[PDB]
Design an enzyme around this catalytic site. Structure first.
Site, PDB file in Angstrom:
ATOM      1  N   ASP C  36      22.169  -3.956   3.823  1.00 19.21           N
ATOM      2  CA  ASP C  36      20.961  -4.510   4.427  1.00 19.21           C
ATOM      3  C   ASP C  36      21.245  -5.025   5.832  1.00 19.21           C
ATOM      4  OD1 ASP C  36      18.628  -6.568   4.801  1.00 19.21           O
ATOM      5  OD2 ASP C  36      18.146  -5.595   2.879  1.00 19.21           O
ATOM      6  N   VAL C  63      20.927   0.257   9.848  1.00 18.97           N
ATOM      7  CA  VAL C  63      20.923   1.705   9.657  1.00 18.97           C
ATOM      8  C   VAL C  63      20.731   2.496  10.957  1.00 18.97           C
ATOM      9  CG1 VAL C  63      20.241   1.625   7.185  1.00 18.97           C
ATOM     10  CG2 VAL C  63      18.458   1.788   8.981  1.00 18.97           C
ATOM     11  N   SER C 141       5.951   7.739   1.893  1.00 21.60           N
ATOM     12  CA  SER C 141       4.899   6.798   1.560  1.00 21.60           C
ATOM     13  C   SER C 141       3.644   7.637   1.443  1.00 21.60           C
ATOM     14  CB  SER C 141       4.731   5.767   2.680  1.00 21.60           C
ATOM     15  OG  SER C 141       3.555   5.001   2.494  1.00 21.60           O
ATOM     16  N   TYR C 154       4.078   4.357  12.161  1.00 19.19           N
ATOM     17  CA  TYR C 154       4.495   4.371  10.762  1.00 19.19           C
ATOM     18  C   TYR C 154       4.120   5.697  10.074  1.00 19.19           C
ATOM     19  CZ  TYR C 154       5.437   2.615   6.007  1.00 19.19           C
ATOM     20  OH  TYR C 154       5.888   2.454   4.715  1.00 19.19           O
ATOM     21  N   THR C 188       2.155  -4.543  -3.028  1.00 15.68           N
ATOM     22  CA  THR C 188       1.745  -5.753  -2.318  1.00 15.68           C
ATOM     23  C   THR C 188       2.769  -6.883  -2.280  1.00 15.68           C
ATOM     24  OG1 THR C 188       0.645  -6.507  -4.335  1.00 15.68           O
ATOM     25  CG2 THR C 188      -0.692  -5.386  -2.680  1.00 15.68           C
ATOM     26  N   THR C 190       6.047  -7.157  -1.902  1.00 11.87           N
ATOM     27  CA  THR C 190       7.207  -7.198  -1.022  1.00 11.87           C
ATOM     28  C   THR C 190       6.845  -7.802   0.332  1.00 11.87           C
ATOM     29  OG1 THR C 190       6.924  -5.042   0.055  1.00 11.87           O
ATOM     30  CG2 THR C 190       7.984  -5.059  -2.120  1.00 11.87           C
ATOM     31  N   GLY C 191       7.857  -8.082   1.145  1.00  7.24           N
ATOM     32  CA  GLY C 191       7.622  -8.553   2.500  1.00  7.24           C
ATOM     33  C   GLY C 191       6.721  -7.616   3.295  1.00  7.24           C
ATOM     34  N   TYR C 213      -7.301   3.508  -4.791  1.00  6.63           N
ATOM     35  CA  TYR C 213      -6.359   3.736  -5.885  1.00  6.63           C
ATOM     36  C   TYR C 213      -7.076   3.924  -7.216  1.00  6.63           C
ATOM     37  CZ  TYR C 213      -2.738   2.695  -2.585  1.00  6.63           C
ATOM     38  OH  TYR C 213      -1.883   2.756  -1.517  1.00  6.63           O
TER      39      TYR C 213
HETATM   40  N1  LIG Z   1       5.671  -2.145   0.364  1.00  6.49           N
HETATM   41  C1  LIG Z   1       4.840  -0.979   0.355  1.00  6.49           C
HETATM   42  O1  LIG Z   1       3.629  -1.082   0.207  1.00  6.49           O
HETATM   43  C2  LIG Z   1       5.423   0.372   0.557  1.00  6.49           C
HETATM   44  C3  LIG Z   1       6.642   0.448   1.205  1.00  6.49           C
HETATM   45  N2  LIG Z   1       7.252   1.687   1.460  1.00  6.49           N
HETATM   46  C4  LIG Z   1       8.612   1.998   1.915  1.00  6.49           C
HETATM   47  O2  LIG Z   1       9.504   1.491   0.933  1.00  6.49           O
HETATM   48  C5  LIG Z   1      10.671   1.024   1.614  1.00  6.49           C
HETATM   49  C6  LIG Z   1      10.955  -0.428   1.214  1.00  6.49           C
HETATM   50  O3  LIG Z   1       9.757  -1.171   1.376  1.00  6.49           O
HETATM   51  P1  LIG Z   1       9.700  -2.696   1.029  1.00  6.49           P
HETATM   52  O4  LIG Z   1      10.542  -3.028  -0.198  1.00  6.49           O
HETATM   53  O5  LIG Z   1       8.223  -3.102   0.846  1.00  6.49           O
HETATM   54  O6  LIG Z   1      10.332  -3.355   2.328  1.00  6.49           O
HETATM   55  P2  LIG Z   1      10.785  -4.858   2.610  1.00  6.49           P
HETATM   56  O7  LIG Z   1      10.173  -5.255   3.966  1.00  6.49           O
HETATM   57  O8  LIG Z   1      10.312  -5.844   1.497  1.00  6.49           O
HETATM   58  O9  LIG Z   1      12.346  -4.913   2.654  1.00  6.49           O
HETATM   59  C7  LIG Z   1      12.986  -4.062   3.540  1.00  6.49           C
HETATM   60  C8  LIG Z   1      14.455  -4.361   3.550  1.00  6.49           C
HETATM   61  O10 LIG Z   1      14.994  -3.480   4.460  1.00  6.49           O
HETATM   62  C9  LIG Z   1      15.781  -4.208   5.341  1.00  6.49           C
HETATM   63  N3  LIG Z   1      15.891  -3.596   6.661  1.00  6.49           N
HETATM   64  C10 LIG Z   1      14.973  -3.583   7.647  1.00  6.49           C
HETATM   65  N4  LIG Z   1      15.459  -2.954   8.704  1.00  6.49           N
HETATM   66  C11 LIG Z   1      16.707  -2.540   8.437  1.00  6.49           C
HETATM   67  C12 LIG Z   1      17.689  -1.856   9.139  1.00  6.49           C
HETATM   68  N5  LIG Z   1      17.439  -1.423  10.474  1.00  6.49           N
HETATM   69  N6  LIG Z   1      18.866  -1.594   8.557  1.00  6.49           N
HETATM   70  C13 LIG Z   1      19.141  -1.985   7.302  1.00  6.49           C
HETATM   71  N7  LIG Z   1      18.216  -2.657   6.590  1.00  6.49           N
HETATM   72  C14 LIG Z   1      17.003  -2.946   7.128  1.00  6.49           C
HETATM   73  C15 LIG Z   1      15.197  -5.584   5.401  1.00  6.49           C
HETATM   74  O11 LIG Z   1      16.128  -6.536   5.793  1.00  6.49           O
HETATM   75  C16 LIG Z   1      14.715  -5.764   4.012  1.00  6.49           C
HETATM   76  O12 LIG Z   1      15.627  -6.430   3.220  1.00  6.49           O
HETATM   77  C17 LIG Z   1      10.451   1.249   3.081  1.00  6.49           C
HETATM   78  O13 LIG Z   1      11.019   2.451   3.503  1.00  6.49           O
HETATM   79  C18 LIG Z   1       8.989   1.279   3.173  1.00  6.49           C
HETATM   80  O14 LIG Z   1       8.527   1.840   4.359  1.00  6.49           O
HETATM   81  C19 LIG Z   1       6.548   2.893   1.297  1.00  6.49           C
HETATM   82  C20 LIG Z   1       5.314   2.906   0.653  1.00  6.49           C
HETATM   83  C21 LIG Z   1       4.706   1.630   0.084  1.00  6.49           C
HETATM   84  C1  LIG Z   2       3.223   0.345   4.153  1.00 10.83           C
HETATM   85  C2  LIG Z   2       3.026   1.282   2.959  1.00 10.83           C
HETATM   86  O1  LIG Z   2       3.594   2.571   3.218  1.00 10.83           O
HETATM   87  C3  LIG Z   2       1.540   1.401   2.673  1.00 10.83           C
HETATM   88  S1  LIG Z   2       0.680   2.086   4.128  1.00 10.83           S
HETATM   89  C4  LIG Z   2      -1.015   1.717   3.587  1.00 10.83           C
HETATM   90  C5  LIG Z   2      -1.410   2.525   2.372  1.00 10.83           C
HETATM   91  S2  LIG Z   2      -3.087   2.066   1.835  1.00 10.83           S
HETATM   92  O2  LIG Z   2      -3.050   0.648   1.347  1.00 10.83           O
HETATM   93  O3  LIG Z   2      -4.073   2.189   2.962  1.00 10.83           O
HETATM   94  O4  LIG Z   2      -3.442   2.933   0.747  1.00 10.83           O
END
Ligand SMILES: NC(=O)C1=CN([C@@H]2O[C@H](COP(=O)(O)OP(=O)(O)OC[C@H]3O[C@@H](n4cnc5c(N)ncnc54)[C@H](O)[C@@H]3O)[C@@H](O)[C@H]2O)C=CC1
Ligand SMILES: C[C@H](O)CSCCS(=O)(=O)O
Ligand SMILES: NC(=O)C1=CN([C@@H]2O[C@H](COP(=O)(O)OP(=O)(O)OC[C@H]3O[C@@H](n4cnc5c(N)ncnc54)[C@H](O)[C@@H]3O)[C@@H](O)[C@H]2O)C=CC1
Ligand SMILES: NC(=O)C1=CN([C@@H]2O[C@H](COP(=O)(O)OP(=O)(O)OC[C@H]3O[C@@H](n4cnc5c(N)ncnc54)[C@H](O)[C@@H]3O)[C@@H](O)[C@H]2O)C=CC1
Ligand SMILES: NC(=O)C1=CN([C@@H]2O[C@H](COP(=O)(O)OP(=O)(O)OC[C@H]3O[C@@H](n4cnc5c(N)ncnc54)[C@H](O)[C@@H]3O)[C@@H](O)[C@H]2O)C=CC1
Ligand SMILES: C[C@H](O)CSCCS(=O)(=O)O
Ligand SMILES: C[C@H](O)CSCCS(=O)(=O)O
Ligand SMILES: C[C@H](O)CSCCS(=O)(=O)O
Lengths: 250, 249, 253, 246
Positions: C36, C63, C141, C154, C188, C190-191, C213
């Site tokens: 991380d 990363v 996503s 994004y 919803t 997560t951060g 949905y």
């Molecule tokens: N939360 C959502 O609604 C959705 C999220 N995602 C994808 O799922 C994945 C994870 O999402 P979440 O758990 O919600 O994210 P998150 O924001 O809760 O956590 C992301 C983690 O990645 C780490 N991170 C950020 N930048 C980094 C970097 N440059 N190098 C290493 N680590 C880094 C952060 O420190 C954090 O711990 C992402 O790829 C996100 O785009 C995709 C679709 C739905």
């Molecule tokens: C950030 C994560 O990839 C979700 S993008 C928004 C999807 S939706 O809530 O408009 O269906």
């Protein structure tokens, strides 16, 4: 006269597919701005095309450089009129799989293709949104819809453009600006096409991917773009239009 | 220019989108055959269109009846010349989810849409393949690309057409016959459009369309005219969304 | 024991979906390395997970920095063994349409998502290819499959990941390395999920979003983690190049 | 125990991929009903699988006959309990292009695949919707996502199933019933695989460098049937060795 009173900017317009789009757009009555990294090429090609009253002008700009592409689009508008269309044709290709790809080349490929589409659109959208009127055609590829061996960065870039097109359509279609992507199959004759080719068996394996039994021409692609630019495509937005001889159908 | 010397058969050409395709094709110089379940309608629409030297002819046929659709295409060719294009526009829609749909209505929706596309194409392909020249445009829908609540049979049928189009392109593109599908969004003004409508719900439907309006028959016709034209020479196997952004979001 | 004898590295593994993937992977018998941007978080989360004999270790790396991510994977392998799986879960989101998006923000979103997937995969692939054995799960996503209003960078980044996954599968599937993408709907809790909510406060838009949905709820980190576990497992031996929608039906309508 | 307390009906369950799904579902603690056109085969296969305390039962039905399939599902529920899952695995394939395909052959391919999926689902959905709980897995194919030379009817049928899956998910996901489609690449060893068996040309279409096995496909179906797939609905899941990725 399908593009009567249209004013179209074409990035990467000095050669290849971009130049063919220019030719076809002039045929249909548009005024055209050729915007190319190679300013001299853009100017020479614009002059070559400016026959029979056709209005084509050349401009120099790197699409990855915000100030330069913005100035080029502003100058185009000052020179030939407010934009009604933008074709984000500028793109480069390269080779490299994820395990061994040149990282600097990766960034440049993503920059020209994706960042260029972003920055050029950003410049054009100010006026188009102000006027509630525009059409933007982005350049995907079959390489943005499927995976191509040894082209990691390019497949990433074109994949980005395909979905960015959907996103832009989501934001702007209701505000009078259609956004679509053409996804061409291989076009042999261009500089990029020649780079790609550069054995009866290998090229034939490639040709076998195309149900139609031939590769594309710049003119094939140009016609699809002219349709998307035209007001006959008034309900067409967010589309990824495959112009690919059947490649992605099989 | 753009369809000079083209000869186009349009199933379901007597009304709605099919009729708009006919009008636009004539504008571009084609000769057209309207082939409709309603023979009288095909004839009246053809007569209406045949002004200023435009050549349109009307024929009756149910696309689900192999002998009848074969005979109509044969008659068309005798009257206006060998086909260079076929538009499989004939289709019907209906409602019913999987748990409660009537099987007979299900079969009829599948028959007109899918079997009709099959049988009309089969008839046209004999000539087109012999001449190594043709273009076939099938009718998908946004309903063939995504799921629409309460339209099980129709989504199945349109889904079949979308992939059958790819299959046909696989077989025939190298033999001189391009095959593509237009996938229209909602077009409210046609008989089918009025059937689907039949206001909070309307507004909810409209919100599915980024462009902020529904389509017109003329909108869809222009895409079809492009696909029929030789300017689309490299376009085959495509499922072309003409849908105001619906499938993009 | 669906992941017994697997060694999985998870980028962005300190929190959110990545952390849920770690937890599930440990349940199935894997050893996991959390990598991380926040080193302390990776280490604290790894400590939290290491109960009942479960082996989780944390490592700090951005990363987007080739040397840093390479070093982390190297240390992970020295610590828990040669990698059999990599989950490119790290990603960030942000808002902005093409006409007004800040170019620097655009670049950072593209970097973490796309460049991060590239650089982490590059590091892991040296060993996986040498061993003719690996599985890589990338994070698309619903935003990589369809357009989302006001999320231009994004949607571009996730679109790149979806097709990069196809490309990597084309190169490596015949060499012993499967590459797939999970495409989650909104999660919803997560951060990032909270970041998404906070961006529009109205409850019309809130209920508007939920109506996208069919399943009638948003996702949980655990929902997404189960799909990733399947893809990492040898039960998915024929699954490669897939963009697997885990989205409550969102992209089906 | 990924399917403990699940009761799963599998059409075409007497052989091939269907039988592999039954085997894996039993491994995960489900009770299984094999429903096959060949009733004797369904019974013999169920008996074979019924060792180690596993519960598998066989039933005969043509999925194209509404009364037949409704009666089999009802008998299944009476014997092993109310359905929580349905796998519409029954399908047939054939060759023929639009220009030369026989219309009766076309109709039977569409009937088993599409009408069968409709009728079997219709029968199962009464109970599933009543209990606000169900999972339905439909069978697409790579042939439902792209065009395959000389297989017009089959590509139409599988194309129908792929989008019908989206439609069903649209209707039923919010009512407690998930609906998904598995889209397998070529699986050589089954009756259909052998029926459809230039051959090196075919293998070159698969980046993974081999064709699939019934077991490979079964594992994806098991995931989709399980409560671990709780957020998965409306998906067309390619299990295809990378075929549709290139
Ligand atoms: N939360 C959502 O609604 C959705 C999220 N995602 C994808 O799922 C994945 C994870 O999402 P979440 O758990 O919600 O994210 P998150 O924001 O809760 O956590 C992301 C983690 O990645 C780490 N991170 C950020 N930048 C980094 C970097 N440059 N190098 C290493 N680590 C880094 C952060 O420190 C954090 O711990 C992402 O790829 C996100 O785009 C995709 C679709 C739905
Ligand atoms: C950030 C994560 O990839 C979700 S993008 C928004 C999807 S939706 O809530 O408009 O269906
Ligand atoms: N040739 C092919 O087989 C296919 C090409 N394409 C896409 O079509 C588009 C055009 O391709 P081609 O005509 O073959 O390209 P090309 O290589 O023949 O010419 C591209 C033009 O773009 C210009 N250019 C390059 N970088 C630039 C930059 N940073 N700023 C402004 N201009 C720049 C070049 O100077 C050149 O004149 C590209 O987006 C390409 O990726 C997509 C599918 C098939
Ligand atoms: N109206 C809409 O919103 C959309 C419609 N469509 C498709 O576009 C096509 C045309 O739609 P519309 O113009 O709205 O339809 P329409 O209902 O207005 O007219 C269709 C014509 O087809 C004819 N027809 C019906 N069954 C036939 C048969 N068995 N054989 C020969 N002809 C037959 C009818 O007589 C009618 O004249 C159809 O395939 C439809 O499914 C697809 C997307 C959007
Ligand atoms: N074998 C392959 O390469 C692939 C097959 N598939 C699909 O997977 C599914 C299973 O395929 P296979 O296991 O290879 O098939 P299979 O031919 O080996 O056996 C299918 C079973 O379905 C039964 N069946 C046939 N018609 C029926 C009907 N009307 N009602 C009830 N049962 C009936 C047969 O008796 C047989 O036991 C099918 O839906 C097929 O289309 C899809 C992709 C790859
Ligand atoms: C560079 C252009 O987008 C073509 S990428 C290779 C496409 S193919 O030849 O593999 O079909
Ligand atoms: C009948 C035509 O194919 C439209 S099906 C319903 C499409 S929408 O109104 O739900 O967008
Ligand atoms: C019958 C099964 O759905 C496979 S159709 C042929 C697929 S391939 O072998 O041409 O990749």
């Amino acid at each position: 006269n399908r593009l009567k009173n249209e004013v179209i900017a074409i990035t990467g317009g000095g050669a290849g597919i971009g130049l063919a789009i220019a030719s076809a757009a002039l045929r249909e009555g548009a005024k055209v701005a050729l915007i190319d990294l190679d300013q001299g090429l853009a100017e020479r090609s614009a002059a070559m095309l400016s026959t029979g009253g056709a209005v084509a002008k050349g401009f120099g700009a790197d699409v990855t450089k915000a100030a330069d592409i913005t100035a080029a689009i502003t100058s185009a508008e000052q020179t030939i009129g407010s934009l009604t269309g933008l074709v984000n044709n500028a793109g480069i290709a390269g080779f490299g799989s994820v395990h061994d790809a040149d990282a600097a080349a990766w960034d440049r490929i993503m920059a020209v293709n994706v960042t260029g589409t972003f920055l050029a659109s950003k410049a054009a959208l100010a006026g188009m949104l102000e006027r509630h009127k525009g059409t933007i055609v982005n350049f995907g590829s079959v390489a943005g819809l499927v995976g191509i061996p040894t082209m990691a960065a390019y497949c990433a870039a074109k994949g980005a453009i395909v979905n960015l097109t959907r996103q832009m359509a989501a934001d702007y279609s209701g505000r009078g600006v259609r956004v679509n992507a053409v996804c061409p199959g291989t076009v042999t004759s261009t500089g990029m096409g020649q780079q790609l080719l550069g054995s009866p068996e290998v090229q034939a394996r490639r040709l076998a991917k195309y149900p139609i039994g031939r590769f594309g021409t710049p003119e094939d692609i140009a016609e699809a773009v002219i349709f998307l630019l035209s007001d006959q495509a008034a309900f067409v937005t967010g589309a990824a239009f495959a112009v690919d001889g059947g490649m992605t159908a099989i």
